[PDB]
Amino acid sequence: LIEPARIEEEELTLTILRGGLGISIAGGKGSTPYKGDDEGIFISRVSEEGPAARAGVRVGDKLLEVNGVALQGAEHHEAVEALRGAGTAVQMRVWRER
């Protein structure tokens, strides 16, 4: 008896179609961190069966990129303005760990 094959970490490109997106982001450079000392932007809440939950967004995902804007080592307002437009779709690369 043994542990199965499991994904330790990954980088996901996800497409979210939407009045809101269904996420709450937390953290950023200059804000109280979300996990450990990593000051990245993370997904802290996913609306139940919202457009982001249908996209596969998971709680704790780190925002690496939004609509081509690299949000690595970015400030909180930098990711909010990159996600507040969201006319109809947002494409974000995320870092998932376990």
Binding site: I23, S24, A26, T32, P33, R45
Partner: peptide
């Protein structure tokens, strides 16, 4: 409380 923003 640690700076969450709803979207």
């Amino acid at each position: 409380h640690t700076n969450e923003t709803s979207l």
